[PDB]
Every structure is written in structure tokens, then in C-alpha cells.
Amino acid sequence: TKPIVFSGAQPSGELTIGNYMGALRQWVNMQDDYHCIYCIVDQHAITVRQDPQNLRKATLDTLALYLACGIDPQKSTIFVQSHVPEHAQLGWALNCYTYFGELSRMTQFKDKSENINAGLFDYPVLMAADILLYQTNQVPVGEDQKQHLELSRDVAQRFNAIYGDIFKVPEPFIPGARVMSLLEPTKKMSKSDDNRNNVIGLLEDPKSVVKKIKRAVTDSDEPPVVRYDVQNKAGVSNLLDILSAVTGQSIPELEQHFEGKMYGHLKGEVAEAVSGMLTELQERYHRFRNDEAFLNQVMKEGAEKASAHASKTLKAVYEAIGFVAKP
Amino acid sequence: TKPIVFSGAQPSGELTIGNYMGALRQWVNMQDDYHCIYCIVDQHAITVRQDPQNLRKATLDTLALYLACGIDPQKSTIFVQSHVPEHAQLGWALNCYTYFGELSRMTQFINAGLFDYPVLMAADILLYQTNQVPVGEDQKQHLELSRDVAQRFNAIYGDIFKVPEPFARVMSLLEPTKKMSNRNNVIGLLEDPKSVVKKIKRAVTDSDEPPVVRYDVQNKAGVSNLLDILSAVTGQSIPELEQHFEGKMYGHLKGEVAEAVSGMLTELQERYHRFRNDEAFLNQVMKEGAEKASAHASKTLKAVYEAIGFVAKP
Ligand SMILES: N[C@@H](Cc1c[nH]c2ccccc12)C(=O)O
């Protein structure tokens, strides 16, 4: 039986080449060997105040972007969280099996903190419901969500001890390419960066892409030497890693290629490689994003697959708890 | 048209005549002056540890008992809370418009459900455009939170919610200064006439010599409470009962109270056992009640989701 993988996607409308070449692009090629579920978590998004029109548009942006990256709605389950009522239903039930102190001591809650709302406090529980609803075996998680996945595992184990093996206990599972910040090559490229000159978005205009890459930090070696050395030449190594990730050429092959050349040549090839990659992705993105009837059909079928799987686990949860079954 | 009243009923099943003749019986008679909604709140019940079988049984007990008292599932909306997903859905959304300090400052307030259930209660009420909510003094603070959250959300997004408003003296048989709510203080609605008469016989009375059937809450609390119970059941004003009991002792009063209470309870109990043992009938009531409740509630939930900025579920 295929492992079940659950991934939450904030409706931001933004991904970086780091997110894509590092995580998503590889997952696109694993949709046949895993049961991949992608959930656009608009219910988590409103734990911070959102402009309503931006939220709706960014939900569709994110959907069209995942489709353009290659998520196939036939092979995978992709949907909008609020379209599947089971997420909020199980979220409430798991509140009653979650300790108050488990939530009050979350780093995200103290790091987001009297002008705080209960959704910021409670969103770890909704996250646990998102995962446990689908008998999830694996969850891709960054270091910042690690504490949240641990709670989901603790709640699944706590519930199972009381009522039987109802939930699968999820595990972290992070498999690709190493993409660092353009002006700070010792820090991973992050979509949350304040300095946007460190980041290349998948939907960034190609003109701005070449500009940012030409600004990418390199070293003061005289004469310049294009070789991979992360400790001494972090900037040059980062550009080599990005170029290798886009073109498939190995680092040694690129080194021989740039023997005797300046860092400007490396930046030039990186810029046109990345720009070409974003050009292909953006052609697909605009096709999908300007056909909102297609997007609606994807959302409808995705939510129906999601609800059909999710309601099996919710019904088992309600039976164990002692709710009268819905006729 | 008719104002909407929302009432949450905990799945307990063991109501007293104080509950019935104080609140639920008048409620039953108001089903055509109001659009009455009765929600059996099993999702609130699990904020404290519940035995699964007892929770399931008590949910059905409450439904059968409310029907037996005269709640009409065609005139009113009666349903089990967990059968209507819109309650949890709006419950989560309203968490994001509730201050954490509002919940921590709650007097009644350990799992997160016990901390967060006031938000779910606000969702329960606001889903149905509720005008009035009958609340005990212990829930007054909860109702005020629901008003604050509704006004706060409306100020941000427009007038989506209606701001709700708050909407027979039966005392303990052994200590009549406290209300009937030690089961010897209590007369349950599902209590056989033999048990009812025995508890009423043990009801405290004064020591006036000669004993007098007169209403006096200061000096004759026990006798007055018995006159209150009889007045509630028969419909006779207390002064009429005083004239009727002139020259009679407290044994005569207690015998009349027992006969009247048991006569009322045999009607309710015959209906309760007919409904309670008919699983198909209860399933039909819960099914139609959930469908009515969801159709009403989905209207508010869809407006909330549209205002907030969610893509509408296609
Ligand atoms: N909290 C996650 C989003 C999320 C919700 N549910 C999830 C389940 C798995 C992974 C991520 C998620 C984030 O901010 O990124």
C-alpha cells in the first residue's frame, strides 16, 4: 500500500526556486508511488488578519501554481481546506484531547505574541486534524513546524491508547537541490525573507530575475576561480548548485566548463537557465490561472476525494467518542 | 417575522420538574410565537471526559424527553450538534476573531476544549441569526462574549451576524431556600409515582400549630414550595389553592401535590418510552432536524466565508 503524504500550502501565491527545486519538483515525480495530498490551508491563514480580496485571489494563485509545477489532480488529492468540513470538525474534537499547556508553550504562539486571538493559540490542533484525517504516514515539515508535528503524533497516540488504533501516527519525511540566498549564501533561500533581493519567486518577472542573479554575492579570489567549495566560496558554490539543479549538469562538469572564466559568466548562465525554467512554469501558470472554471472543477473534485477519505476517519472518531451516528 | 430563539441542551436526560415547569414547558407553548431551535450539544459534552456509551445513551434520552414534553420537530428545529458540521466550521473561524485574553478571563475557566468552548457556543448561536438565547446565570458571561464577537466581526466585514439578546419557582424538597436542580431534593420527569409520593412525603414543612396551608416564603418555605408545585401543574393560582386547603393539614397538601405531579408525569413518561424505544423514529427526527439546521446554518456560514475572503466551495 502506498504511503500517504500530507502537505499544507499557505494561500500566499508565492513559491521560491528553493521551494521548487528543493522540495516540490521532486514530489511532482513521486505522485505515482505515494498517495500525495496537498491542502491549501485558508483556515490557518485567517489566524492573522487577511485582506479578503487578497486571500481569495492568493488561494487561486497557489492552486494554479501547484498545477503548473506539475501536481496532477488525478493522481494526487489537491483541495482548499475550507471546502472540506471534516477538518474543522476533527479540529474541535481533538481540542478535547489536547492539553492547554501543550498549546500555551508552543514557540510559534510565543513568537506571534494581549492583541492575540484564539486561532493563533489553537491552530496546532487544526493542523493535527488536517494530518490525522487521512491516515497520513508522512508529513513534509520544515524545522519551524517540527513542534507542531510532534503534537499531532502525541494526540494520535493519546487518542489511540484510549479508544484503539484509530489514527496513524505521522512521521516527518524530508527527502533535492541546495538553493541559498543570493546576497547571503550561508542562509537558505526563504520565502519569508524581508530582503526580496535574496529570493527568486517562481512567478517573478524574468527581467527582475536576471537583475537579482547578477547581484549575487561571490568571493574576492584574484583571479576568480569557479569551483565548488561551500566553506570558502559559499556564493560561487550556490550559483553552481542552482545551475546544476536547473540543467542537470554535474558540479564537476560545470567546473571544467568555467575553467578560466569570471564569476560574471557563471551568473549569466545561471540567469538564463533559471529564466528559461520560470518561463515554462509561467506559461502553464497563466493558462491555468485564467481559466477559473477549470480551477473550480479541480477544487470541486479535490474536495470530494478529500471528504470521502476524511469522513471515514471522522466517523470512526465520533463512534469511539460516543456521539450518536448521523443518520 | 418570528424571533429566533436558540437553546443548547446538554445530553443529560435526567430533567427535574423544576427544569420542566420553570423553562421547558413554557418554551413548548412558545413554539408558534418564536422560531425555536434546540441543539443537543454533544460536542460541548466532550470538554469533560465522557464514557462513550453513556454519552450516546444520554443524547437519545434528551431527544426523546424533549419530544415527550411537546417539542414539535416540524414547528421547531431539534437536532444533535455533531450532525451539523457548520457548528465546528464557524467555531474555528470565530476563534480568529476572539481574543485569547477574553477566554482566559472567563470565570468558569485542563484541555483546550474546556478553554475554547465559549467560542463554539458563540458559533452555535450566531449560525442561526439568533435573536434571543435563554441562559442561566452561569452562562451570562458566555452570551456576552457571543455579542462582542458578533459586533466585532460585523464592524470588520458588514452586518453578517445578528447580535443576540438574553431571552414557576420549584425549590429543593429538603432545603427550600435553594432551587431544585442528593436526588431526594429532586423529582425527575421519568420518576415513577411511587418514588414521587415518597419524596414529597419527606418534603420539609414548618411547625405551625395548627398547621396552615398558607403561602409565605419567609416563614413557611416548605409549605409554600408545595403550593408552588401544585399551582404550576394544575394552573390554579396560589390564592385559589389557599381557599381550597382551608382547614386541611400538610398531609392533605402533600397527598394532593403527589397526585397532581404523578398525573402530569404519567403523560410525559408514556410518550417518552414510546419515542425512546423507537430507534427508527428517533433517527428520522435527528435526520430531518439536522437537514433543517444545516440549510439554515449554511446560509450564515457561506456569508461568513465570503466576507472573510475564502474561495467559495464549488
Ligand atoms: N502550519 C503550516 C501549514 C500546515 C497546515 N497543516 C499542515 C499539515 C502538514 C504540513 C503543513 C501544514 C505552515 O504554516 O506552513
Ligand SMILES: N[C@@H](Cc1c[nH]c2ccccc12)C(=O)O
Ligand atoms: N453550554 C450550554 C449549552 C449550550 C451550547 N450552546 C449554547 C447556546 C445557547 C445556549 C446554551 C448553549 C449549557 O451547558 O447549558
Ligand SMILES: [Cl-]
Ligand atoms: Cl521557505
Ligand SMILES: [Cl-]
Ligand atoms: Cl561568498
Ligand SMILES: [Cl-]
Ligand atoms: Cl438545573
